[PDB]
Amino acid sequence: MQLRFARLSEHATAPTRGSARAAGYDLYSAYDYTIPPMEKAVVKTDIQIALPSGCYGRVAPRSGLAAKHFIDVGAGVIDEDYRGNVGVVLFNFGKEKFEVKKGDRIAQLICERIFYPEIEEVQALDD
Amino acid sequence: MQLRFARLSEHATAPTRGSARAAGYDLYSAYDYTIPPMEKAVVKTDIQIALPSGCYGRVAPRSGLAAKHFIDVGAGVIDEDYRGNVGVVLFNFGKEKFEVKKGDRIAQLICERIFYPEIEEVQALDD
Amino acid sequence: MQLRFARLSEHATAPTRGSARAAGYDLYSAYDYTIPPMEKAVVKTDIQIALPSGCYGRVAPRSGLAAKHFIDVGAGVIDEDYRGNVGVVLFNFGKEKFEVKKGDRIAQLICERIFYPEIEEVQALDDT
Amino acid sequence: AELPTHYGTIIKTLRKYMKLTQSKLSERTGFSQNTISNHENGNRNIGVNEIEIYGKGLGIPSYILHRISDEFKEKGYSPTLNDFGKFDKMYSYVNKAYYNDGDIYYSSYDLYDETIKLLELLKESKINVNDIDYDYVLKLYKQILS
Amino acid sequence: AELPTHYGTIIKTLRKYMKLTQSKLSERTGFSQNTISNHENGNRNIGVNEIEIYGKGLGIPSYILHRISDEFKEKGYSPTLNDFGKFDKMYSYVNKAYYNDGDIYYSSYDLYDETIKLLELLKESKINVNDIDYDYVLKLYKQILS
Amino acid sequence: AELPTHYGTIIKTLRKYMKLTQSKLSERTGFSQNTISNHENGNRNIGVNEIEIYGKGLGIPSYILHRISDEFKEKGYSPTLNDFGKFDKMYSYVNKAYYNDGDIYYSSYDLYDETIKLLELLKESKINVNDIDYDYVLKLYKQILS
Ligand SMILES: [Mg+2]
């Protein structure tokens, strides 16, 4: 399948991908946020997604923001059925504040392929 | 695909999954822990697992704990052959203390599908 | 398939993997670094990689460094086409300083299998 | 180790609640009606891995059957299983809300408890469960998460 | 629900820039030659998802077509589309640099703007583009990222 | 570029340690028994990537063969390759311990060095390696990681 999305507001940017073989689609903030040092923000994108089958959506860090402004992405598991507003949990681990403006790139969305396995209890497992 | 597990003590909860298409199985603590602010704990689950072949187990963060209490998951690669006690390395980056009680949900276990490729040195790679 | 790499300098160690079914290849630093507490360093490996098709490279944490010295790995997405020097963005969240010596293992490289899907905008999606 | 006997009561009550016969459940689970009987009637104990099958057979997430058992292990009885209709109704809103609203999705800790908190807040406000709708329950849900 | 008209002009100009005939693009994208003509001539508006097709047909990242449109929505015209050759030249250096040099890969924010910053820095220094090489541009690029 | 000559000595010693003949190695993971003999005799150098093949053939993780070479590059000889039996015994405990115990799994840095540290700790305590059991070595192992 494909990655279907839908704008939830006037303020959302469509996810973009630069190369044909780039790991993730870029996610853009829909609002202005000021994250204090050593603090966290749930940045809303105002888009809803439906991931292709056989994968979940990993909200992954941008290497730029990480190496230069000490920005990580907390949480970041998007379920196959999550149909609400995709949010990006940003951790600012820097000494200064970090400034999110609408239309800024703050993460990428990778379609991590996973199994959906059946759980089965046993007495013990052979070491 | 099946995910066989085994209880290592009376104190372990069986891994649970809400939806049939949810990204990971919930992992529950087996003990009480108090993680001071800006500190870390290896939370034992008292379960051992055997993952389906062609994947590893990623101990991923819960979106709630991350957005509201600034809780991340350090480390988190579970090898295919790891047969010991699945532990979850928790980072408390918040300003307050964070309280883990037995039976709390502290992570999810995703079966990330990966390749196991053979390594091959070259003089250089064509860009 | 195969994971081709190439040394970019005299100082690089070839990626190694312990078990035949281990999740990632070990990545070794090519230099000494002293990371202050609550600070970060992009540890250069002086190797370039080309990943097998249908996956990207995740630079993932080593469980030891994380549980014992509070060391996390920032960033860590290596695109299929990245042909430059593989670097590992190390976060030292400990109270002391952390010491990277040349030839130290500082991360692992997992071949995360992913889709490369085509995007398609819709008016709205039927809610679950 | 095998499972407590009250899982028989739990499976039995919920069978009668989903208007399912032992024969219909026998087709879904694959167990003989005799096996289901001795399980429900308390004669033999249900294996750890058989509850997952029953959950599919009954169409109730096996996750929930244990949370009901947890109420037997503590209170002696299960108030959720007692008035399970009000629970099934609320849980489905709590679920829908979790998978469709970001405030809930990035804030919920455990849907099961949140459903109970919601049913207790409705009893405290003297409001029936089949009198409120998904949109109203969401407003309430969002308050209890801050 | 449809896209502005200027996407026709954009597709048209860039078609003429990649020295591609309407018939050649008709097989590259899969749109009938009439569809492309009414699209380029401003007669019918391009669907939201058809631009990705055009980008592949043209061999220009669809990500870029929108960044050009962003310039029409603001300035009224598009200076990038005006002197698109100097852009394509620089963008290909910026790209090569991002995908082959670690300082750029672990530092770049958005390749499009960085290309524009670089073209504006060369205009301020009165240097033509066919006087600089990849190695000269890289040195400059690395400075503008600190 | 080809690999140092001592990899021949390493391949030879480890062949005799796994009771494997040159023709057996050619049938397991080799091109010709004559090629393998000229590599071991030092007349031909093993290619950079041929070591991985040899490792599977011998049934020793190729990761370890290079760590032995590292000891030639420094010490001039390889004491590990000298008394490799005591190593193989300890390594197999270290491995089992790493993959089965959380304290080891979430604390180890490098299995190879840890095996050497452990063999050196037994030499300091004058304890034979074929006299201690897996459970004894684990107790020591966890100490050397604290
Ligand atoms: Mg993290």
Numbering used by the authors:
A (entry chain A), B (entry chain C): 24 to 150
C (entry chain B): 24 to 151
D (entry chain F), E (entry chain E), F (entry chain D): 8 to 153
Sentences from the paper on this structure:
The lack of dUTPase activity leads to high cellular dUTP level, and increases the frequency of uracil incorporation into the genome upon synthesis or repair as most polymerases do not discriminate dUTP over dTTP4,5. Overwhelming of the uracil base excision repair mechanism by perturbing the function of dUTPase induces DNA fragmentation and cell death. In 2010 it was discovered that φ11 and 80α bacteriophage dUTPases interact with the staphylococcal Stl protein involved in the regulation of a Staphylococcus aureus pathogenicity island.
On one hand, we determined the complex of hDUT with the crystallizable amino terminal domain of Stl (StlNT) by X-ray crystallography. The complex was crystallized in P212121 space group, and the asymmetric unit contains a trimer dUTPase bound to three StlNT chains. Based on HDX-MS and 3D crystal structures a peptide segment of Stl including residues 106–113 directly binds to the active site of the enzyme. In case of the phage DUT-StlNT complex the N-terminal of the dUTPase (residues: R15, E18, N20, H21, D24) serves as a secondary interaction surface with Stl (residues D77, R74, Y70 and Y98, N102, Y106 respectively). These interactions are missing in case of hDUT and LvDUT, as the residues in the matching positions are unable to interact with Stl. In case of φ11 phage dUTPase sidechain of Stl-Y106 forms H-bond interactions with the N-terminal of the enzyme (residues H21, D24), while it has no detectable interaction with hDUT. We showed that the C-terminal part of the Stl protein omitted from the crystal structure has an important role in the enzyme inhibition as the full-length Stl is needed to exert maximal inhibition on the human dUTPase.
